[PDB]
Structure formats: structure tokens, C-alpha cells
């Protein structure tokens, strides 16, 4: 049974301060007794700018009830730094919050601030934790953005070794093996292979990358993630579309991977993004009428949800 804080000897010196939104506010929330009581005393604590262990305990009680309470998270981080608290202990507490399904922009940002301030010489154990944490939701947007930040921040400090980058690509390849439709993992591959400042750009790496892309398409011909990655790849490096057309043409009915001689089952043709590739390759050949004919078929037959967009592309050919 609940003991109000006015009855606790540890809080007897503190006069709580009521929430002030006026006499008849709109969108009022029917707070539990526990939540109102804690915020009443938090208002008093924040008003007197008290930095103490009891204030720290109070912030944890509050964010457990409302993990999105950015003001209380802000106060909690200033408590940790003012008291010189163990930031590694706080990281373990955050691991529990994720386990108990306490999550928000605010918890993820709190974790970032901890890693920034700890500034480990090697962030490998945090990288591995993030990998494991993707098990209940392999597309968690906050988690993927945080992983990008972690590698970017600690690479600026010079603390990501070549072996670490190599095992990160190994892990990414396994994520896409388990689900080739995970667009978050495709985005991570782009960082690892293309956009990060330390990435290699050579004749071999471009060949390797195109092989991986084309193999992925031949495994899942209708996977939009692989088509977008292919188009982004060619555009980013200013590579022509025509030399690759042999691998794409079978979906529109050299040594780079080709489609299976019988295509896999459940692969109805044509693949609309294959047609888009063909049209754009026609445009690359200045064959605007051939491109316009392909756009017209996308508009009226093969991708009718986008009939207007493909008609717009058709008209541009004139």
C-alpha cells in the first residue's frame, strides 16, 4: 500500500509544489496518486536546484512511470554529472529499461550522452549490445540511428580499427541473409561500403559491390530494397546502366551474376522496377521514344497505382 511522500521522514524538509496549468486546463490527464506525488516533489527539487541522491532516486521513479518525460531525463543527467556518479552503472540500468519495455527518444538520447561522456577507448561492448538489442525489433529506427552515431563519433576519435569495420560488415551480411527485405540493414551496408569517410573506392570494391547487389536481386527479384540500392549505387558513382542490362532484361518480359535459368517460383513478370531500369537505360541511350513506350506500359498496365507519375515521366520524354 502506498505511503505518501509527505509521510516519509527522508522528505520532511521539502514543501511540494503543485502543477500550475491554471484553474480549468484543456487536455488534463487523470494522474495516479504515485505519479502526481512524485512530480509534486520533483517540482520542489528542481525549483531549489537540489542535486542529491534522493533527487536521483526520484527521477528514476518518475521516468519508470513516464519514459518520455524529457525534463526529468535532463535533470537526471545533470544529477549524474554533478554527483560524479558511475556512468557504467547507469548504462546497466538502461539495459534493464530496454528489457522492461521502457523506451522513447529520451532513453535513447540518454544512452548516447552516457557513451559520449564515458568516451571508452574501445566501444566494442556497446556495439555488441546494440547488435543483440535488435532481436525483438530488427528494424527499430532509433537503434539503427544510434549505431550510425556510435561508429561515426568513435571513428572521428580514431577508435574504430580495421578489424572492427570488417566484423561489422560480417554482421551486416548475416542480417541481410536472415531477412534480405530488411531495409534498415541495406541502409547500414551503404554506410559501411559507400558513405562513411574511410570507405575504400577502388576498381575491385566497385566490382565486389555490384556482384553483391546483383546476386541479391536474383535471390529476391521483387525486393524493392535491392533495386533502390542498385539505383543509388549506379547514380552515386556515375556508372552507366547499359553494360548491366543483360542481368536486368530477363525481369522485363559479361561476368556479373545472371538470373537463374528457370527463375524462382512465385516471380511474376515483368518486375516494375526492372522496367524503370530499362526506361532509364533507354534515356541514357537518348532513345526517348523507347523510354516513353516503357513508361506508358508502367502507367497503364504494370504499375497502375503510380499511373500519374509514370505518365509524367512519359511526357518528359517529349
Amino acid at each position: 500500500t502506498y505511503i505518501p511522500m509527505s509521510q516519509r521522514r527522508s522528505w520532511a524538509d521539502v514543501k511540494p509544489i503543485m502543477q500550475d496549468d491554471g484553474p480549468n486546463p484543456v487536455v488534463p490527464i487523470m494522474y495516479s496518486e504515485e505519479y502526481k506525488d512524485a512530480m509534486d516533489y520533483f517540482r520542489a527539487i528542481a525549483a531549489k536546484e537540489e542535486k542529491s541522491e534522493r533527487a536521483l532516486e526520484l527521477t528514476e521513479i518518475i521516468v519508470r512511470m513516464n519514459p518520455a518525460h524529457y525534463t526529468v531525463w535532463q535533470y537526471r543527467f545533470s544529477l549524474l554529472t554533478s554527483l560524479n556518479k558511475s556512468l557504467e552503472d547507469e548504462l546497466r540500468l538502461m539495459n534493464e529499461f530496454a528489457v522492461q519495455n521502457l523506451k522513447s527518444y529520451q532513453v535513447w538520447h540518454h544512452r548516447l550522452l552516457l557513451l559520449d561522456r564515458i568516451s571508452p577507448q574501445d566501444p566494442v561492448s556497446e556495439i555488441e549490445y546494440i547488435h543483440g538489442s535488435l532481436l525483438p525489433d530488427p528494424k527499430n529506427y532509433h537503434t539503427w540511428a544510434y549505431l550510425h552515431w556510435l561508429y561515426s563519433h568513435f571513428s572521428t576519435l580514431g577508435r574504430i580499427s580495421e578489424a572492427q569495420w570488417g566484423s561489422e560488415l560480417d554482421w551486416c551480411n548475416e542480417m541481410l541473409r536472415v531477412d534480405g527485405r530488411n531495409n534498415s540493414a541495406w541502409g547500414w551496408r551503404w554506410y559501411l561500403r559507400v558513405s562513411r569517410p574511410g570507405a575504400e573506392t577502388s576498381s575491385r570494391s566497385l566490382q565486389d559491390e555490384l556482384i553483391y547487389i546483383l546476386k541479391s536481386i536474383h535471390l529476391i527479384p521483387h525486393n524493392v530494397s535491392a533495386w533502390n540500392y542498385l539505383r543509388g549505387f549506379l547514380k552515386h558513382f556515375s556508372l552507366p546502366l547499359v553494360p548491366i542490362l543483360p542481368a536486368i532484361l530477363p525481369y522485363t518480359a559479361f561476368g556479373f551474376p545472371m538470373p537463374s535459368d528457370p527463375l524462382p517460383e512465385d516471380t511474376p513478370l515483368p518486375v516494375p522496377l526492372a522496367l524503370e531500369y530499362l526506361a532509364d537505360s533507354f534515356i541514357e541511350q537518348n532513345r526517348v521514344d523507347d523510354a516513353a513506350k516503357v513508361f506508358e506500359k508502367l502507367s497503364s498496365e504494370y504499375d497502375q497505382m503510380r499511373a500519374g507519375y509514370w505518365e509524367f515521366r512519359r511526357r518528359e520524354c517529349a
Binding site: 539503427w144 540511428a145 531495409n183 534498415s184 541502409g187 569517410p197 530494397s225 517460383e265 497505382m305
Partner: protein, 488 residues
């Protein structure tokens, strides 16, 4: 008007093919296809002259949705505590939805809205998610509070606009405290950095006449570098230093409808600003391509997904659908700079809203993510905002902007903001007044094109017209921004 916007009921519905390669993504996609297609099969085609006997009628249940929103003006159950730091969003979702639905609040209730929000305003600058004695200011509640005051306030002594005007300098100082050298903003003291903050800040700074050069420096570069290889935009970009002038910027996650909306809208607001070589360009063609590729197939009802290989969801009607006119205008400017059918299926999006996103009839009302999900204030607001964009053909009109320039009175205005750094303001009055004229004239440049209306299911489904970029009615935007620029 509908030759290139085929109805979902007129197209063959087929599942996303498997290529004989099962995965967790495809499991969820197929289950969602079953959910949505079954509800369409039970619902009469909204395009029929006589609604079919035995099937559900898809008409917009405006009175049910009004009653769903009404709890906002009484109280919310204790489970809403998860939104205790987002109460201005609860206001905005409610009062903008009521505007769209055509339902007026009486003056006493509007005054309560105004008074509640002014209790969230800190003297040192900005609105928080709740009372200023409880929560610190935050860029996102600041947008929601400012837009809500545009919807519910007025120019009298109790109307709240007078209070906002007096807060202009402090709000500006809050914005400059949030500013990072690379062009990002923290959303609050010690808070995260992403394009939601940039969007919310630029909307408010545009509306209140508090834009300066020091506020905007590098903001265009931060946003441009959020664009991904897919053509949409991520939450943020990372500045790598040389060893305010990074060697390069790299996007930090996937293209997402919410961040693509914020980035396109931010970039569009910056194109009004007369600074040299500003804003840094984006790839508008790729953003338009990404936008249209997110509209789902007939089997999933023609709603929008928020990112590649995820599920359709009614709230992306606003985030992705509402970005379409912005991307269109940027593409048009690029084409013009080098020297019409709808760009997304305006009919199918309405069908998703009417058939799949409304709560089942005779119930709580409200609109929702998908069948099987409880409705909430957020999906109610964003479903209806996207529905408005689909019903009304919106474009940014150069002749309207020109007419606005011709009527602008630069000798009227509130006091210039005082920059935090000595040389952080405009160079002189000629340049400041030219900036005010361009920013005001372009903010008021969106029009509904006559004869472009498409109301699926009949005129009783029509809702009011929202504005791209701001997401408030034009009849709210015009007197509000005119108040702060002293125009009439």
C-alpha cells in the same frame, strides 16, 4: 480528373510475390494484406451511385470523429501519462482535426485553450510539453503550441497572439541556445538533434518574423545531407571534422516519411530566404520518386508506408502524401531552371482513409493506423490532414507570390530581434525588409487549384483544405502571420 488515379476496386489485387524466399518482413506484409483486403471486400465501393446492400457504408463518420475528440475538453484516462510531456500535441491534434472536420469551438472553450497553452510558455523562451513550472521548453511543443494558438487564438487582449508577440525575443534566444555550429538544433537543453527540430523551429521563426542570418547558418547544409540513396531523408546527418566547417556530412539512418516530410518542408521554407548561395540544393527528382514509391498496392488499400519494406499506415497520408506537393514544386523549379496528371493516386488514398483508417461504425469513433489498431488523436489528425491533401489539389503559385510582394507593406512590423552576436543580423534595413517580404509572400503562396477537387464518395465526405508545409487551414495561417508582420 481521375484518368490516372484508378480506384482500388478497379484494379486486380495480388499479394507481394515471395520469389520462394520467406522472411519475417514477408510474413508481416502478407498478414497485413489479408487484414486490409478483407475489410475492403466487406465495404461497398465508395464510387458507386447507390451503395450496395449488405456491405459496409464507407462515408466519413464526421460526428463520430467529433465525439472521439471531445474528451480533450473534459479529461483523458490515466494511461495518457505517456503523453504528459506532449500535451500541446494533444491540443493541436484536437483543434486542427476539428478545423478540418468543420466544427467550431465556442469562445469560452477557445479561451481555455489559449490560457492552458500560455501556462506552458517560459519567460526565458519557448513552450514546454506542459506547465512552465514543471517542464523545460522544447522545439516540438513550441510548434504545436504556436499552431494551436493560430487555430484557437485571436488578436484581442485575451487571444494569446499579443503574448506571443511579446515573447518574440525570448523565443528567438531559446532558438539560438538550441543552435549547433554544423546547422543542427537540439530539441531542448541536452536533447537530441534531428530534422524534426529544424522543421518545428523554421515554421515558428517564419510565422513570428524572427529569422536572422545567424539563426540560419549551415541549416541548409545539415538538412541537405540527410537525403539518402533512396531519395527520402533520414533523421540527421553527422558532421565529420576537417582533421562549423566539416570535411563532409553523412546521413545517419533510413529514409523515413516523417523525416522526409520535415526535411522537404524545412528546405522549402529556406528557399524563401534571400541569402547568397542559399539554401544548398537537394535532389528533388529523387525525393519525388521516393515519395510516390511509398504508396501501397491495391491489396493494401493504397495507403502510404513510412519506409521501404515496412507496412502501410494511415498517419503517413500526411507525412508522405503531404510532402508530395512540396517535392512537386521543387521539381518544377528545377525544370524551369533548366529551360498535368496527379503525382500520386489521389483516389486510392481517399479510399484507404474512408474504408480502412476509420474506426468501425457505432463505436468510439476516431481514425487509426490500420485495421486492428485502436484509434488515437495522432492518427485522427494525420489521417485527416492527408485526406485533405488528396481531396484538394495544392500548388505553390508564382503569380500569387508576386501579388503578395506587390501588397506587402515593409513600413509595418514588430521590433526587429536583437541578434546574440554583434554581426548576426541582416546587413541593413533594405536587406531585412527584402527578407521579410520574401518570407511572408512565399508563406502565403499555397493555393487550391480551381477544378482540381476530387471528393471520393460524394461531397458529404469533403473536409477543409490544409496548407502544405504548415499543416493549418489557410484561413488560420493568413490572419496569424499577418498579425506578426503587421499586414492587413
Amino acid at each position: 480528373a481521375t484518368e490516372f488515379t484508378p480506384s482500388v476496386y478497379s484494379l486486380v489485387s495480388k499479394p507481394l510475390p515471395s520469389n520462394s524466399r520467406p522472411s519475417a518482413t514477408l510474413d508481416e506484409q502478407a498478414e497485413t494484406e489479408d487484414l486490409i483486403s478483407q475489410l475492403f471486400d466487406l465495404t461497398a465501393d465508395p464510387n458507386a451511385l447507390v451503395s450496395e446492400h449488405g456491405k459496409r457504408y464507407s462515408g466519413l463518420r464526421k460526428q463520430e470523429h467529433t465525439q472521439f475528440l471531445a474528451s480533450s475538453f473534459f479529461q483523458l484516462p490515466g494511461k495518457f501519462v505517456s503523453l504528459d510531456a506532449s500535451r500541446p500535441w494533444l491540443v493541436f491534434w484536437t483543434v486542427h482535426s476539428l478545423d478540418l472536420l468543420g466544427v467550431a469551438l465556442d469562445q469560452g472553450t477557445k479561451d481555455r485553450v489559449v490560457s492552458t497553452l500560455l501556462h506552458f510558455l517560459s519567460p526565458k523562451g519557448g513552450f514546454g510539453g506542459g506547465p512552465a513550472n514543471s517542464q523545460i521548453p522544447h522545439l516540438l511543443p513550441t510548434y504545436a503550441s504556436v499552431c494551436s494558438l493560430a487555430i484557437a487564438g485571436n488578436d484581442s487582449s485575451t487571444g494569446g497572439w499579443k503574448d506571443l508577440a511579446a515573447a518574440r525575443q525570448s523565443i528567438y534566444e531559446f532558438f539560438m541556445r538550441c543552435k549547433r555550429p554544423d546547422g543542427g538544433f537540439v530539441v531542448c537543453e541536452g536533447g537530441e538533434v534531428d530534422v524534426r527540430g529544424t522543421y518545428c523551429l523554421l515554421v515558428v521563426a517564419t510565422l513570428l518574423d524572427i529569422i536572422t542570418p545567424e539563426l540560419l547558418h549551415n541549416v541548409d547544409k545539415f538538412v541537405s545531407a540527410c537525403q539518402t540513396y533512396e531519395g527520402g531523408f533520414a533523421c540527421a546527418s553527422f558532421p565529420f571534422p576537417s582533421v562549423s566547417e566539416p570535411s563532409c556530412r553523412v546521413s545517419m539512418a533510413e529514409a523515413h516519411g516523417g523525416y522526409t516530410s520535415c526535411s522537404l518542408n524545412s528546405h522549402f521554407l529556406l528557399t524563401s530566404v534571400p541569402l547568397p548561395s542559399f539554401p544548398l540544393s537537394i535532389d528533388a527528382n529523387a525525393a519525388l520518386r521516393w515519395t510516390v514509391l511509398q504508396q501501397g498496392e491495391p491489396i493494401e488499400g493504397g495507403g502510404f508506408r513510412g519506409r521501404t519494406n515496412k507496412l502501410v499506415d494511415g498517419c503517413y497520408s500526411w507525412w508522405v502524401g503531404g510532402g508530395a506537393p512540396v517535392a512537386e514544386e521543387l521539381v518544377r523549379r528545377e525544370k524551369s531552371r533548366k529551360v498535368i496528371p496527379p503525382i500520386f493516386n489521389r483516389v486510392a488514398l481517399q479510399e484507404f482513409t474512408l474504408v480502412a483508417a476509420q474506426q468501425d461504425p457505432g463505436s468510439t469513433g476516431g481514425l487509426r493506423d490500420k485495421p486492428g489498431k485502436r484509434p488515437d488523436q495522432y492518427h485522427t489528425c494525420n489521417n485527416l490532414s492527408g485526406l485533405s491533401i488528396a481531396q484538394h489539389k495544392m500548388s505553390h503559385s508564382p503569380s500569387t507570390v508576386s501579388s503578395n510582394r506587390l501588397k506587402f507593406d515593409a513600413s509595418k512590423g514588430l521590433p526587429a530581434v536583437k541578434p546574440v552576436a554583434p554581426g548576426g543580423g541582416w546587413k541593413n534595413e533594405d536587406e531585412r525588409q527584402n527578407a521579410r517580404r520574401e518570407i511572408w509572400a512565399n508563406a502565403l503562396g499555397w493555393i487550391e487549384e480551381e477544378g482540381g477537387e476530387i471528393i471520393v464518395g460524394g461531397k458529404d465526405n469533403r473536409i477543409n483544405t490544409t496548407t502544405p508545409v504548415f499543416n493549418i487551414l489557410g484561413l488560420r495561417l493568413k490572419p496569424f502571420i499577418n498579425y506578426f508582420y503587421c499586414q492587413e
